[PDB]
């Protein structure tokens, strides 16, 4: 896998 950060500001 591509082991990568992402931002989650979901509600």
């Amino acid at each position, epitope marked *: 896998p591509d082991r990568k950060a992402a*931002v989650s500001h*979901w*509600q």
Partner: nanobody, 121 residues
Framework: VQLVESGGGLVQPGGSLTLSCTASGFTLDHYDIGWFRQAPGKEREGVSCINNSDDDTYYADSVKGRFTIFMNNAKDTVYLQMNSLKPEDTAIYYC???????????????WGQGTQVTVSS
């Protein structure tokens, strides 16, 4: 679980797409699964997440209303319905396991190459 994406394309603004996130036909109802995207010049962001055990769904403010994340009765696919697409929605879209649908900045295992969505007139 090794998930991958399908359903991209180039659509005109105002159109729609349905993306699919699958793991070889295995059922997904145990997992929490996020849909993410990485647009040109932008940080990779989570746009929608489903907690399948608890029946919760989460949306980024930029997509709420327009996007929905769901399974159907087969439970083999996490769909992303994307309505009223705008140029700003152009990105590679990725899916991954997102335990708890946590907010913040975590690392994910992106097993798929993503699916390109281009919204262009």
């Amino acid at each position: 679980v090794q998930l991958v994406e399908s359903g991209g394309g180039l659509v005109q603004p105002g159109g729609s797409l349905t993306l699919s996130c699958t793991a070889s036909g295995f059922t997904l109802d145990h997992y929490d699964i996020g849909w993410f995207r990485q647009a040109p010049g932008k940080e990779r962001e989570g746009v929608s997440c489903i907690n399948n055990s608890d029946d919760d769904t989460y949306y980024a403010d930029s997509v709420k209303g327009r996007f929905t994340i769901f399974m159907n009765n087969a439970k083999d696919t996490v769909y992303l319905q994307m309505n009223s697409l705008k140029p700003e929605d152009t990105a590679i879209y990725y899916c991954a396991e997102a335990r708890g649908c946590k907010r913040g900045r975590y690392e994910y295992d992106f097993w798929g190459q993503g699916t390109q969505v281009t919204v262009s007139s």
